[PDB]
Ligand binder design. Structure first.
Ligand SMILES: [Mn+2]
Ligand SMILES: [Mn+2]
Lengths: 294, 10
């Protein structure tokens, strides 16, 4: 297919989104990812090469992609994500910080021949258009809400002994799954301590806390997305887009652009400008795969 | 919204 992409800072004082698109034409294989970093860019930077390499490795070990073992593909991509996060946390600890507290979300799409898989953590979103109809392919990992993932995430966080205030875990983080974010994982106890030292809560408060598991995890949801000849285009984007434009609206908008000039790169740039005209307040990154059709 | 914030108890 053809790719259109854009990644802009918009109204934020820093740019922490990034995008990756890598193809192997001989193998009919492509990897597209949007990363939405927070509290710095070091996690995003790490993921840029490390996640690709690990995913490619996890799936090549066994020529795994089109074997039809969904379970095995799913397990491979999960272990890839978990492994990368393990390595990131070490890196953040040794090649850092000392005040680097960064993290990043990630929505990855892998296509090989006529199969597509999505590995997703966080609050970017992927959608496609199929015979004129929208399919929303991912669900949000937020510690509040009503979608399938939402109730389960809040349950998982509370189960780990964390709490949620102002729609944030420990009043801090607004996503429940992410790479990095060591203070919610292997340094959560230290986190409580720092809070006392910085006067965000009392000593007796920390006493009543009992962390059982990690509050934030990098374990992805994994989806298999059937590809058919009537899939018109696929869109991966950060929440800088979706928070300000409903997916049914973006799909109609892109369809209109492509009917107009058939240029996916121009469609993508014009879409990002619509998001800015609507005064989205975040970095905005968009990747569109134009598969053509009718 | 800013994705992180200084933490707060319930
Ligand atoms: Mn961000
Ligand atoms: Mn964002």
């Amino acid at each position: 297919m053809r790719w259109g992409y854009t990644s802009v800072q918009g109204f934020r004082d820093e740019m922490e989104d990034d995008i990756v698109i890598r193809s192997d034409a001989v193998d009919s294989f492509s990897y597209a990812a949007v990363f939405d970093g927070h509290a710095g860019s070091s996690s995003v930077k790490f993921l840029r090469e490390e996640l690709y390499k690990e995913c490619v490795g996890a799936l090549q070990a066994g020529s795994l992609l089109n074997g039809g073992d969904f379970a095995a593909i799913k397990e491979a991509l999960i272990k890839a994500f978990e492994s990368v996060d393990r390595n990131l946390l070490k890196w953040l600890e040794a090649n850092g910080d000392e005040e680097d507290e960064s993290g990043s979300t990630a929505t990855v799409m892998i296509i090989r021949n006529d199969v597509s898989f999505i590995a997703h953590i966080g609050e970017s979103c992927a959608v496609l258009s199929r015979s004129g109809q929208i399919e929303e392919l991912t669900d949000y990992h937020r510690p509040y809400g009503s979608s399938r993932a939402a109730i389960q995430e809040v349950k998982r966080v509370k189960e780990a002994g964390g709490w949620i205030v102002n729609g944030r875990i420990c009043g801090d983080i607004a996503v429940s799954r992410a790479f990095g974010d060591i203070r919610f994982k292997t340094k959560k106890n230290d986190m409580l301590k720092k809070g006392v030292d910085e006067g965000r809560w009392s000593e007796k408060f920390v006493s009543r806390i009992e962390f059982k598991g990690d509050m934030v995890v990098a374990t992805p949801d994994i989806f298999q997305v059937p590809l058919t000849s009537d899939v018109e285009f696929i869109i991966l984007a950060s929440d800088g887009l979706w928070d300000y434009m409903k997916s049914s609206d973006v799909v109609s908008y892109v369809r209109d652009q492509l009917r107009k000039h058939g240029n996916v790169q121009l469609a993508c740039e014009s879409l990002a400008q619509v998001a800015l005209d609507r005064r989205s307040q975040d970095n905005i990154s968009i990747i569109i795969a134009d598969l053509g059709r009718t | 919204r800013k994705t992180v914030a200084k933490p707060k108890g319930p």
